[PDB]
Design a protein around this ligand. Structure first.
Ligand SMILES: [Zn+2]
Lengths: 223, 173
């Protein structure tokens, strides 16, 4: 397998150096500009285009198309590492969830809780759309493109991403990142003071601190 | 008495049997045996008989009795019931004011700024705002479990009064 550290540096190089002959050929480095907007919280999602990557490294594009999930995580971490370099400005406080984070910083002075951006791939122009019948089991885990008609859509629901608890006795806080479709919550304090004294303090979950994302379910059908 | 569980002024098995002693006139022979000099060998037994009879009645309250006790107990019992009801009402209202008005899932959380924990930082308080008026940190804790052999002594007995007929007879005897 590849060294994902080397791949991380290659991705950083792409973000740092790529220009699409952009802004009417003025070569203003589209992804650098995007990183400025992301750093100043002007924008949330970032759609990286695989046709741009193909100009420098088609083998990287092929590496992405199979086992896409690894490269999703990789690109997200690369963007988080590069974001402070494109910052120059202090942003105004505008969200209760971030007021909690600000209090947490003030008291301190995991990264998943702070990572307020989304990263998605726009498919390479080589890949023609499949019909819903041709997405067979040899395509598990691979990036695909599909075409059809929508039949049903749900309302938008809050989906849990990381839970935040508080302890009645010791005044500390704890975190629990969520990935599977289900989880089991915490009960009793794992901090060293409570544990060593066996003082039995309980954990209360805080909807003012935990992180949520907009989630919706949909169905699509053959022509 | 654990089997009978009778209210005061009702007759227990001992009370009914004692009343039967009076109704039979057997008590007169106890007084003869106690008063006659030559019957001294029986007087020692009569002491046990008499002392067995009077066990439930203390002499001070027994000396207290009289024919007007009916109205006295009736009126006093109404007064006792009144004060008992009043006490429960008062205690209920104190608890009602101490509790918050909104339901038990209404939530909220406060930091007691400057009051440090057992840990390095300030206390976080999860309960209702009104509870801080009389706060003590121990309120959440269960009591210490004592060992079996560590327990102190206790009474196996309780105060009582027999039926008024029995009380009057005992006073005469
Ligand atoms: Zn604790």
């Amino acid at each position: 397998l590849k060294d994902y550290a080397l791949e991380k540096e290659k991705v950083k190089k792409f973000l740092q150096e790529f220009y699409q002959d952009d802004e009417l050929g003025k070569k203003q480095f589209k992804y650098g500009n995007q990183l400025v907007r992301l750093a100043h919280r002007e924008q949330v999602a970032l759609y990286v285009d695989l046709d741009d990557v193909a100009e420098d490294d088609p083998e990287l594009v092929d590496s992405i198309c199979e086992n896409a999930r690894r490269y999703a995580k990789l690109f997200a971490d690369a963007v988080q590492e590069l974001l402070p370099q494109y910052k120059e400005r202090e942003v105004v406080n505008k969200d209760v969830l971030d007021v909690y984070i600000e209090h947490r910083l003030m008291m301190e002075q995991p990264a998943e809780l702070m990572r307020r951006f989304e990263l998605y791939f726009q498919g390479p122009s080589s890949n023609k759309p499949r019909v819903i019948r041709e997405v067979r089991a040899d395509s598990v885990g691979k990036l695909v493109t599909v075409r059809g008609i929508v039949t049903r859509v749900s309302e938008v629901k809050p989906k849990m991403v990381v839970a935040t608890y508080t302890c009645d006795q010791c005044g500390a806080e704890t975190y629990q990142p969520i990935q599977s479709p289900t989880f089991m919550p915490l009960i009793m304090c794992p901090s060293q003071e409570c544990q060593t004294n066996r003082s039995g303090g309980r954990l209360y979950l805080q909807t003012r601190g935990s992180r949520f994302i907009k989630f919706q379910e949909m169905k699509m059908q053959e022509h | 008495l654990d089997q009978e569980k009778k209210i005061d002024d009702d007759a227990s098995a001992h009370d009914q049997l004692l009343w039967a002693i009076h109704l039979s006139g057997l008590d007169d022979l106890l007084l003869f045996l106690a008063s006659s000099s030559a019957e001294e060998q029986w007087s020692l037994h009569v002491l046990e008989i008499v002392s067995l009879m009077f066990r439930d009645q203390n002499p001070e309250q027994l000396a207290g009795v009289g024919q007007g006790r009916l109205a006295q107990e009736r009126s006093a019992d109404f007064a006792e019931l009144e004060v008992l009801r009043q006490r429960e009402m008062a205690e209920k209202k104190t608890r009602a004011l101490q509790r918050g008005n909104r339901h038990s899932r209404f939530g909220g959380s406060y930091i007691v700024q400057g009051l440090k924990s057992i840990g390095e930082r300030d206390l976080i308080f999860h309960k209702g705002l009104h509870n801080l008026r009389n706060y003590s940190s121990d309120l959440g804790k269960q009591p210490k479990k004592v060992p079996k052999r560590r327990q102190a002594a206790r009474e196996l007995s309780i105060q009582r009064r027999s039926a008024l007929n029995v009380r009057l007879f005992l006073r005469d005897f």
